[PDB]
Design a protein around this nucleic acid. Structure first.
Ligand SMILES: [Mg+2]
Ligand SMILES: [Mg+2]
Ligand SMILES: [Mg+2]
Ligand SMILES: [Mg+2]
Ligand SMILES: [Mg+2]
Ligand SMILES: [Mg+2]
Ligand SMILES: [Mg+2]
Ligand SMILES: [Mg+2]
Ligand SMILES: [Mg+2]
Ligand SMILES: [Mg+2]
Ligand SMILES: [Mg+2]
Ligand SMILES: [Mg+2]
Ligand SMILES: [Mg+2]
Ligand SMILES: [Mg+2]
Ligand SMILES: [Mg+2]
Ligand SMILES: [Mg+2]
Ligand SMILES: [Mg+2]
Ligand SMILES: [Mg+2]
Ligand SMILES: [Mg+2]
Ligand SMILES: [Mg+2]
Ligand SMILES: [Mg+2]
Ligand SMILES: [Mg+2]
Ligand SMILES: [Mg+2]
Ligand SMILES: [Zn+2]
Lengths: 144, 81, 72, 141, 55, 129, 140, 102
RNA sequence: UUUCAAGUCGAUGGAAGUUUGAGGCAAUAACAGGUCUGUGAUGCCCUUAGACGUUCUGGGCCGCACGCGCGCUACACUGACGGAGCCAGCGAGUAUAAGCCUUGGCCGAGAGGUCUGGGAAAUCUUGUGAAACUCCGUCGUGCUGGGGAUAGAGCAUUGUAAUUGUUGCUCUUCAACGAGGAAUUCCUAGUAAGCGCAAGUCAUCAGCUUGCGUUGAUUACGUCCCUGCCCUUUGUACACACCG
């Protein structure tokens, strides 16, 4: 509840899930740099890890940093609701998942060929780079 | 059946609008001017103003008798109503 | 992009704050940011304590604006 | 002369009733309070994670004090706000039903309110007794 | 056989489910106060019904 | 972050859809199958199956029974392109109307749970220039 | 009963029914003290009818108002009008008219809206535009 | 089944005949020593319909604004049921409709 | 002030002193203006059984290298979120239906589900406890917690039927945009601008109109410089009238 000082404990650059995180960002919003981790998700893993949000990223110790990456990789194990997850009712094994930095684009990709392999209409328009959700293209989306 | 106040006064007006055009098409040749619907207990008085009240009330009032019957059978009214 | 304002308070800046803020006609969140090069969040906690420590007198209290002056 | 709830500012009265309700500790807090957002129109959960449920229950108690048989559906509309539809204009959206229903149910088991006849939730015989008490311990400073 | 196909598609809760009192049209219908009249048919019958222009 | 490794494992993997592999999937009744697919499919079967979807399945079943040298089960034609693909009809070939022609599709396992008309585009793609 | 006069003040839609009774000087807004007006920056609008004449005028009378309708700001102007009109109306009925004309002089010399309701109302919207006078942007 | 608290509800589009029937009933409830409550002016309802002027869709966007005012009045009488009904036939008017509820 | 006339500008009183504010109606003629895609309004022409009638199924009217118009979000700190305070007006609402407005209670993070009750309505929904707004906090000039397209996975509602996602909700992705050239629109007081709400379309869907109210200004109260129209004079070989 007052200004405090520290020396040599701050860490300017963090590396989490093979992604570089700026250490002077508040912890809740620093994790949003990790692709697959939004503001809503970062708020809960910090609250499940008992890491108070009033700390900057460099303020955290190694003990806390490992405790966060453990929760993100095992959300259901930390009373994180299934509906709160990124990839729930997975296509192949039917279990609730939350894909992260490098895994997200792989299974996002795997979904694209899975749409294109069966040659569905939604997959076809995805291939063309057009809007797939029924949007009109007559007059919008003309950039490149 | 149970009809709201807003929807009842409009229905009376809509009934008047449709009834008025019916006389214009049927009694066009007799100089039809207008119709007045005088509601009363146990009866629905309708006063039609025409130049010729013989064409409507012709051959022992056969047409007017056969013309009120066309309204009882279309608005589900009692024959005496 | 050129801001790069300091958000962690070390010891060299801490006593520099307590040595410079008293010699100010008017201190505020922007005044602390403008001249002490500290961040806005760090300025707000500094003001709320400096008032509790008696160095700073609260002219006006508001969430969006904190008007403070020297206590000497 | 006496003191009532209406004789104290609303904003700092709730901050005082929230503090008492947390320190008393008898209010039962549902297990999802650290996860959920207050309204579907909101985009983030409350910033005061430890105390937001107590403060909202304190707000609910004060709001019910001043009225007669307010329901739980009306409470969702009261705390609801403008939703941030992306490109469409803003709109008012009601708050979450469970949070409000749990609070009034939680407030019902702490003794301050009860189900009123002809709908709603009245304030209890003891509900007036203890709110007016908190008002007195609010304005002495 | 044919009777189960002729005019078999549902014609309720739709725009084709209702029509003007006067012209039996499907477009521009007015359902307020149970008028069930086309907007064009309404103008030529508004005075008879009891609707007047005041302001 | 500690570390990370991705050594993917197998065991003669059979194609699987949401935890159910092809072997059990195909002889599951469609009543049981709909309980493990999306919300839209689950709602549709609770709303009541009219005679049209059930009639196509009966014909599709017979078309496979027509041939027992294990080749393609001959095409059944239909207009009903709001049909949801079920494991019972995997491998069958259907002619799905696109408004003008009978687009021919063979029901692959990855097509299950999709709408039958979603694989027959109703419009020829635009080609400027 | 006792010496009781009842009046009202109005703004755009807000209407504040003032019950100026007599007594020890009780002045409440919807059962709440004026010392708790929600708009703090506008707290001096309802303080004006008090400090203009002096709080000694309110020793013998108590005022309870019920303000409904309008908006947040429109309600403040309705309340201050009901108070000013209530004080004048009580003097005209239970005090000499010389004092009533004195109070009315200070109020009118400061702000007409203390006693006279503002007659401004919202102009109706006309078709061909999104507002009363505003029109849809034209293109050639 | 004798003297009752009886409500007569009056609705019409035009106020002149409505007030004549209302006053005539009040007049007959005066010389007859019958205690009465009313008439009560209910807030008038403005039934508004706003259509486009153009039968087609060409021209300036001009709109009609039609109106249908409905005025409703209720009068409470303390009299036996035979007396109140015959009062209605005395003050019968084509425009105004009458409903009687106990 | 004035021809001391019509009037105009200031004060005072007044609720109101701009036609008190705002509208509805609105002359003599006219346009090849727009509609036969409103009419069981119509003349004529075409078709009338392999129909150009009507009905059923499916698709399309949404289709996308592009030019243009009415708009909505925004580009941040006069701000975003998070709690808290908490105020309108115009209106609408059903029955043996083919289902209306729906409180209150109970489940559900939500979206939503379920059980009762009120209301054919100044009675109940409803004080429609609306949003901007205000207070206290977090953020701290950063493509950042501005902005929320595009897209992946999932949960509900309506509907026979949602695939070319009707719509809503949850997590994730988080794009151009850092105030906009030549040009050009609307507007003078409760007005402009924000800000929402209702009614219409409507089984579902409002970034649309018609209204309503909340907060509420800057700047003229003048001119013919641009633009359009009217009048007078003038020219005319035009009168089907310069599309001569
Ligand atoms: Mg609100
Ligand atoms: Mg709120
Ligand atoms: Mg915004
Ligand atoms: Mg927005
Ligand atoms: Mg076809
Ligand atoms: Mg006028
Ligand atoms: Mg032409
Ligand atoms: Mg035709
Ligand atoms: Mg035709
Ligand atoms: Mg039509
Ligand atoms: Mg044919
Ligand atoms: Mg179109
Ligand atoms: Mg398309
Ligand atoms: Mg326009
Ligand atoms: Mg806010
Ligand atoms: Mg009401
Ligand atoms: Mg960003
Ligand atoms: Mg988005
Ligand atoms: Mg200009
Ligand atoms: Mg111009
Ligand atoms: Mg649609
Ligand atoms: Mg709508
Ligand atoms: Mg000449
Ligand atoms: Zn019609």
């Amino acid at each position: 509840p007052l200004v405090v000082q520290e020396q040599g404990s701050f860490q300017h650059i963090l590396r989490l899930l093979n992604t570089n995180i700026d250490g002077r960002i508040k912890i809740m919003y620093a994790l949003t740099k990790i692709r697959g981790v939004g503001r809503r998700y970062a708020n809960l893993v910090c609250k499940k890890a008992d890491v108070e949000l009033t700390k900057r990223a460099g303020e955290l110790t190694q003990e806390e940093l490992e405790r966060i990456v453990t929760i993100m990789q095992n959300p259901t194990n930390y009373k994180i609701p299934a509906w709160f997850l990124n990839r729930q009712k997975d296509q192949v094994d039917g279990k609730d998942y939350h894909v992260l930095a490098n895994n997200l684009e792989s299974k996002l990709r795997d979904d694209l060929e899975r749409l294109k392999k069966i040659r569905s209409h939604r997959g076809i328009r995805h291939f063309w780079g057009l809007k797939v959700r029924g949007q009109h293209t007559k007059t919008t989306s003309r950039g490149r | 059946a149970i009809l709201s106040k807003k929807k009842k006064l409009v229905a009376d007006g809509v009934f008047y609008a449709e009834l008025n055009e019916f006389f214009t098409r049927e009694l066009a040749e007799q100089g039809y001017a207008g119709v007045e619907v005088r509601k009363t207990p146990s009866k629905l008085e309708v006063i039609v103003k025409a130049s010729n009240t013989q064409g409507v009330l012709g051959e022992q009032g056969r047409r007017i008798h056969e013309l009120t019957s066309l309204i009882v059978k279309r608005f589900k009214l009692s024959p005496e109503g | 992009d050129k801001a790069q304002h300091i958000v962690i308070l070390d010891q060299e800046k801490y006593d520099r704050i307590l040595k410079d803020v008293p010699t100010y006609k008017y201190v505020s969140v922007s005044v602390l940011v403008d001249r002490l090069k500290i961040g806005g969040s760090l300025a707000r906690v500094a003001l709320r304590q400096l008032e509790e420590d008696g160095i700073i007198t609260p002219v006006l209290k508001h969430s969006k604006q904190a008007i403070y002056t020297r206590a000497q | 002369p006496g003191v009532s709830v209406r004789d104290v500012p609303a904003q700092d009265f709730i901050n005082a009733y929230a503090q008492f309700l947390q320190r008393q500790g008898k209010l039962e807090v549902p297990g999802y309070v650290d996860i959920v957002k207050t309204s579907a129109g909101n985009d983030l959960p409350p910033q005061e994670a430890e105390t937001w449920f107590y403060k909202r229950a304190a707000s609910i108690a004060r709001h019910i004090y001043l009225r007669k048989q307010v329901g739980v559906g009306a409470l969702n509309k009261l705390y609801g706000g403008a939703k941030n539809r992306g490109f469409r204009p803003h709109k008012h959206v009601d708050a979450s039903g469970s949070i409000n229903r749990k609070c009034v149910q939680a407030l019902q088991k702490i003794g301050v309110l009860e189900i009123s006849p002809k709908g709603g939730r009245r304030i209890s015989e003891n509900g007036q007794r203890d709110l007016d008490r908190i008002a007195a311990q609010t304005l002495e400073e | 056989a044919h009777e189960n196909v002729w005019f078999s598609h549902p014609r309720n809760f739709g725009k084709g489910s209702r029509q003007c009192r006067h012209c039996s049209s499907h477009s521009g219908l007015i359902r307020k106060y149970g008028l069930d009249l086309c907007r064009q048919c309404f103008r030529e019958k508004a005075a008879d019904i009891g609707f007047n222009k005041y302001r | 972050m500690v570390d990370a490794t991705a050594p993917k494992k197998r065991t003669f993997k059979q194609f699987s859809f949401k935890g159910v592999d092809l072997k059990d999937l195909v002889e599951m009744p469609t009543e049981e199958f709909t309980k493990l697919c999306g919300a839209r499919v689950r709602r549709r079967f609770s709303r009541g199956l009219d005679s049209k979807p059930m009639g196509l399945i009966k014909k599709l079943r017979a078309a496979r029974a027509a041939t027992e040298p294990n080749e393609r089960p001959a095409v059944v034609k239909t207009h009903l392109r709001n049909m949801i693909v079920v494991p019972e009809m995997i491998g069958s070939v259907v002619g799905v109307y696109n408004g003008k022609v009978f687009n021919t599709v063979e029901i692959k396992p990855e097509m299950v749970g999709h709408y039958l008309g979603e694989f027959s585009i109703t419009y020829t793609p635009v080609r400027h220039g | 009963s006792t010496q009781s006069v009842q009046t009202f003040g109005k703004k755009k839609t807000a209407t504040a029914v003032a019950h100026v009774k007599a007594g020890k000087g009780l002045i409440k807004i919807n059962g709440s003290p004026i010392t708790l007006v929600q708009p703090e920056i506008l707290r001096f609008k309802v303080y004006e009818p008090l400090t203009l004449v002096g709080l000694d005028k309110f020793q013998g009378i108590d005022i309870r108002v019920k303000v409904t309708g309008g908006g947040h700001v429109s309600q403040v102007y309705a309340i201050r009008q009901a108070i000013a009109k209530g004080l004048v109306a009580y003097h005209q009925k239970y005090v000499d008219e010389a004092s009533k004309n004195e109070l009315k002089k200070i109020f009118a010399s400061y702000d007409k809206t203390l006693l006279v309701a503002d007659s401004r109302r919202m102009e109706p919207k006309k078709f061909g535009g999104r507002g009363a006078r505003a029109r849809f942007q034209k293109s050639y | 089944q004798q003297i009752h608290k009886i409500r007569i509800t009056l609705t019409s589009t035009k106020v002149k005949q409505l007030e004549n029937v209302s006053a005539n009933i009040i007049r007959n409830a005066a010389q007859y020593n019958i205690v009465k409550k009313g008439p009560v002016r209910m807030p008038t309802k403005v039934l508004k319909i706003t259509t486009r002027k153009t039968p087609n869709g060409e021209g300036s966007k001009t709109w009609d604004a039609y109106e249908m005012r409905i005025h409703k009045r209720v009068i409470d009488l303390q009299a036996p049921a035979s007396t109140v009904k015959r009062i209605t036939q005395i003050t019968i008017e084509p425009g105004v409709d009458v409903e009687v509820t106990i």
